[PDB]
Q: What sequence folds into this?
RNA sequence: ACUAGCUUCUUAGGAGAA
RNA sequence: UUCUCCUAAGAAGCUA
């Protein structure tokens, strides 16, 4: 019976990618309102420790992720890593207006909540 | 004339993708742009002017 | 993979364009 | 000079252009009245007309309104295509410049209402009386009653005005404190999702005189018409709340120890806030059904993914399930050089030939899926004329009255091709075959009972297709989840099959083009329509810019076949699952989860039939708008004058389902505007004299209706008008036609573009590179598709079938009759 | 590596006729 | 055994 196999695998995925969910942030944002009902679009906006901005070009990198620390969703994020859409690490000093057309366009900056 | 260059550019980007060019998005984007720009070409001059660029991109590596 | 390279080369030689010919002689 | 009037008398009725008592003392208290012995040149009716009857060469009124109220300077109109929404989206801002002005008028209207309520006056609030500043005048058709008990009529007013409320975003100030644009945005509490009080406050502040009761949460509606009304209101009232407040409402559930996050509701932008019914906090030893619903629930996924900010697209992203963004690219199609040399050796691809290779398997870089999903930015919230919509939905259901539908059991499903993916949260372990062979019939029945009382949000995975194209776009596909499509099949696969098995209808889904079927369809469309001309259109970006209101209308029309097997709550919860799965659900590009603004998923189980409902809706709407926008005193036929008058009366003077006139107008259309609708393509045979006089739809009416209702400008390159019937439809499903002799009788044959069939011959999308036998049947099918080209007068076109034949000859179906018996009726 | 529709080719099963 | 029709499986083409 492959039904039991797929049920075991799907429950394994359910229980495996649920570990990195609770950091005493949901229990703060859920019990502070009536009915304990919270929209989903604000669950990762207020509890996700890690964040990633996908910048199309430097003109929108300077506007949002200016420097090693930037604000978003009423919180501060310190840029922890940058990737150039090829799993190649890009150092923060490499991003510049002069050295703009020498990297991939979508820059994935990974930051942590301050 | 036009069909020949269009078809050879198709097979050229085919062998390019087989050459793991998609692993370098900076170059794959330019290859794709040349491909889609010559596939809509209406003049042979620009078609050749971009086919030579695609060929130069091809021979940049030892493939 | 070799068949694609061979057919590309044969189609390029059949094209017989001046700029393409100079490119293929500079590459070889 | 012509002025737009909303006239309604005993002889003429309609909203159209026309070439033209001491009650005033009891209304000078309200500041919303002009001083009667001052005014502006254009009244608000002129604005509503110019924005609902928009066309080129006659848009001077809209231009003179925009350049007179500080919206855009005169050197903004010299730009070509300044009016389109797909191209030049900046016009949206140019329209939003009027929004606040419109809002003032709204408030002034309410003031006037209170005046007419306090002064005890009855009368109709006609749009041609309210100044574009906001003042009313022309008090000649108002009757004085007892003060404190007189009521005004605002049905026609607010109905006609509803489109420009979301077109110009008149309610854009409600995001600011003290309702002033010079103030910061209202910092709405992130935990607030209900907004019922705010919706009721906005309704009482803007539509206090609206007679019909309005429910902010659509679960409290009375019928499908009430759902349409309340959703059309919530569409306008949801453009003011934080966009992060909508979507599925989740909560902490307790599952056998470790807690989970499960969505127990959904705050739609149209259906208010809908709470699940079969919910439980303490869940232990759950079955496979609940486990599958929780897996397909985005609550679990977006609650443990990294917060994402995607500046590539304006769409509201949610999260990223994978620690790195996936950049999937579209490979170029493999090349079959054998057919290419075979074609060039037989005198093809020559210089100046009429046939030229134009269809190729275009390659796309790593920014394909995102930059193509970003085309949803053309999907704007649209508030449709609710009386017009509530009548057009009746006429459209009359167009779908011949079929028959209803909820079917899980054992009588006719699902085919179980070898395809099953959405994102399930494709990691198998295709739909496993999920259809695992869940027993009682499991699927229980799942359908669950979605009949709850809301199951799903994640439609956005993938890139690998098909040929004559254009450079990516044309992504949206694989919906198996949990959504299973219930959609159980709920719809009795009406969809009955549409796919009914000939001679307006919807021609299921009707084959082979075996003389094309002649059947064309002769059905013709159907003794006097002064016949053919007309066709193709909706620009129908998958993206289709409003939420018309998609809800389509799902309600498709759900109107459950008058016995479904309750009102059951039908509403099925509509809610539709909205939460295929209208505003959250999509997944690569490993990153975004929120589709309002686009209608192209991967829905019922995408073709719902799109056909939407196309018929737009066509009926163009017809009613053309019939109303004509001067009643100029129509020669008295029956048509009475038809237009009763149409206006059933629109803006009635509230019940006037089935008598509904059927009368349906017959009038089906006898004078005969349509053939395949899911975006429409060939209509219409009367020449009627369209020239304006009594039926035309190209201009469709363009205007798409402008104000569909939010896209239909360019003249995608529409066509055929004058003679000897030449058939210029294009239907990209199949040109022609009257050809086949068996001593002139019939119609569909011939595709020779470029398309040639490209299908040369370029292969990783099919023939594996074996040589697949080429045989592939070219058999291509010859079946390309045979009619022989009857084409152009020899260069006709030689395509001969080339395909000569290629199939060297198999190593050969006869030119296996490809001709496809077009003899049998 | 989606949904629906139509049409082919190849293996099997059930019916009607010879 | 032959022919015709209707279903089950796989593959392909076209359309939206
Ligand atoms: N699931 C699919 O693979 C799929 N593939 C398609 F090509 C089309 N559809 C549906 O038909 C409509 C096309 O209508 P269509 O007249 O072709 O215009 P379009 O929306 O494709 O844009 P454009 O006119 O610029 O090409 C789409 O809205 C979509 O609902 C699909 O579901
Ligand atoms: Mg068409
Ligand atoms: Zn209601
Ligand atoms: Zn039902």
A:
């Amino acid at each position: 019976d492959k039904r039991a196999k797929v049920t075991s695998a799907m429950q394994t995925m359910l229980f495996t990618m649920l570990r990195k969910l609770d950091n005493d942030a949901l229990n703060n944002i859920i019990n502070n309102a009536r009915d304990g009902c919270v929209p989903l679009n604000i669950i990762p906006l207020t509890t996700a420790a890690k964040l990633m901005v996908v910048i199309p070009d430097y003109n929108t990198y300077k506007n949002t992720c200016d420097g090693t620390t930037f604000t978003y969703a009423s919180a501060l994020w310190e840029i922890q890593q940058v990737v150039d859409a090829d799993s190649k690490i890009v150092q923060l000093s490499e991003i510049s207006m002069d050295n703009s057309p020498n990297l991939a366009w979508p820059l994935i900056v990974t930051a942590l909540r301050a | 004339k036009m069909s020949d260059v269009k078809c050879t550019s198709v097979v050229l980007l085919s062998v390019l993708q087989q050459l793991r060019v998609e692993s370098s998005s900076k170059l794959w984007a330019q290859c794709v742009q040349l491909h889609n720009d010559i596939l809509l070409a209406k003049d042979t001059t620009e078609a050749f002017e971009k086919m030579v660029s695609l060929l130069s991109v091809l021979l940049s590596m030892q493939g | 993979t070799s068949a694609m390279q061979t057919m590309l080369f044969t189609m390029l030689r059949k094209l017989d364009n001046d700029a393409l010919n100079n490119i293929i002689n500079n590459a070889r | 000079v012509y002025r737009a009037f909303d006239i309604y008398n005993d002889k003429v009725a309609g909203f159209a252009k026309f070439l033209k008592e001491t009650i005033y003392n009891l209304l000078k208290d309200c500041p919303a009245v002009a001083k009667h012995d001052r005014l502006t040149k254009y009244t608000m009716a002129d604005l509503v007309y110019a924005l609902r009857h928009f066309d080129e060469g006659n848009c001077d009124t809209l231009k003179e309104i925009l350049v007179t109220y500080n919206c855009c300077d005169d050197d903004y109109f010299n730009k070509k295509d300044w009016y389109d929404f797909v191209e030049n989206p900046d016009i949206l801002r140019v329209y939003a410049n009027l929004g606040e002005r419109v809002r003032q008028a709204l408030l002034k209207t309410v003031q006037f209402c209170d005046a007419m309520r306090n002064a005890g006056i009855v009368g109709v609030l006609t749009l041609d009386n309210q100044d574009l500043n906001g003042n009313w005048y022309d008090f000649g058709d108002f009757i004085q009653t007892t003060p404190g008990s007189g009521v005004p009529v605002v049905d026609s007013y607010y109905s006609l005005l509803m489109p420009i409320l979301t077109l110009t975003r008149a309610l854009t100030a409600e995001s600011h404190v003290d309702t002033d644009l010079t103030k910061p945005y209202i910092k709405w509490d992130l935990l607030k999702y209900d907004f019922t009080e705010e919706r009721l406050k906005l309704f009482d502040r803007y539509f206090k005189y609206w007679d019909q009761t309005y429910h902010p949460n659509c679960v409290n509606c009375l019928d499908d018409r009430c759902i349409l009304h309340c959703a059309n209101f919530n569409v306008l009232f949801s453009t003011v709340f934080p966009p992060t407040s909508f979507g599925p409402l989740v909560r902490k559930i307790f599952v056998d120890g470790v807690p989970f996050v499960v969505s127990t509701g959904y705050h739609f932008r149209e259906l208010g806030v809908v709470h699940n019914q079969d919910v439980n906090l303490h869940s232990s030893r759950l079955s496979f059904k609940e486990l599958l619903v929780y897996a397909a629930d985005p609550a679990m996924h977006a609650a443990s993914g990294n917060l994402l900010l995607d500046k590539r697209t304006t769409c509201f992203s949610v999260a990223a399930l994978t620690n790195n963004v996936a950049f999937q690219t579209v490979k170029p199609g493999n090349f079959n050089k054998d057919f290419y040399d075979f074609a060039v050796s037989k005198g093809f691809f020559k210089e100046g030939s009429s046939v030229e290779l134009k269809h190729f398997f275009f390659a796309q870089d790593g920014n394909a899926a995102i930059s193509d999903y970003d085309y949803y930015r053309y999907n704007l919230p649209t508030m449709c004329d609710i009386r017009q919509l509530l009548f057009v939905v009746e006429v459209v259901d009359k167009y779908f009255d011949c079929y028959d539908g209803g909820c079917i059991n899980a054992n009588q499903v006719i699902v085919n091709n179980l070898d395809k993916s099953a959405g994102f949260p399930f494709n990691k372990w198998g295709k739909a075959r496993l999920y259809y062979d695992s869940m027993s019939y009682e499991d699927q029945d229980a799942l359908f009972a669950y979605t009949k009382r709850n809301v199951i949000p799903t994640i439609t995975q956005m993938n890139l297709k690998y098909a040929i194209s004559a254009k450079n776009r990516a044309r992504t596909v949206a694989g919906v989840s198996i949990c959504s499509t299973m219930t959609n099949r159980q709920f719809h696969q009795k009406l969809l099959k009955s549409i796919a098995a009914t000939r001679g209808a307006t919807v021609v889904i299921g009707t084959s083009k082979f075996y003389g079927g094309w002649h059947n369809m064309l002769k059905t469309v013709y159907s003794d329509v006097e002064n016949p001309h053919l007309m066709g259109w193709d909706y620009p970006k129908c998958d993206r810019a289709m409003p939420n209101m018309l998609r809800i209308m389509a799902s309600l029309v498709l759900a109107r076949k459950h008058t016995t097997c479904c309750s009102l709550s059951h039908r509403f919860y099925r509509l809610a699952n539709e909205c939460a799965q295929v209208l505003s659900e959250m999509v997944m590009c690569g490993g990153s989860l975004y929120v589709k603004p309002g686009g209608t998923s192209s991967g829905d189980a019922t995408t073709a039939y719902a799109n056909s409902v939407f196309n018929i809706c737009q066509a009926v709407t163009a017809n009613v708008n053309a019939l109303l926008s004509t001067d009643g005193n100029k129509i020669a036929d008295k029956y048509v004058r009475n038809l237009q008058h009763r149409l206006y009366e059933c629109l803006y003077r009635n509230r019940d389902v006037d089935t008598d006139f509904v059927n009368e107008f349906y017959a009038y259309l089906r006898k004078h505007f005969s349509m053939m609708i395949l899911s975006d393509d429409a060939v209509v045979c219409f009367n020449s004299t009627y369209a020239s006089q304006g009594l039926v739809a035309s190209i201009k009416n469709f363009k205007s209706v798409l402008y104000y209702q569909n939010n896209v400008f239909m360019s003249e390159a995608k529409c066509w008008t055929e004058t003679d019937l000897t030449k058939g439809p210029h294009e239907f499903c990209s199949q040109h036609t022609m009257l050809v002799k086949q068996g001593d009788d002139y019939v119609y044959l569909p011939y595709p573009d020779p470029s398309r069939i040639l490209g299908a011959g040369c370029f292969v999308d990783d099919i023939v590179k594996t074996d040589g036998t697949l080429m045989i049947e592939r070219f058999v099918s291509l010859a079946i598709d390309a045979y009619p080209l022989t009857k084409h007068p152009n020899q260069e076109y006709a030689d395509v079938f001969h080339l395909y034949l000569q290629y199939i000859r060297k198999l190593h179906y050969w006869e030119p009759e296996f490809y001709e018996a496809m077009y003899t009726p049998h």
Remarks:
- Strands of chain A lie at 38-39, 50-55, 69-71, 76-83, 107-113.
- Residues 2-16 of chain A form the longest helix (15 residues).
- The two ends of chain A are 49 Å apart (CA to CA).
- Chains A and C do not touch (no CB pair under 8 Å).
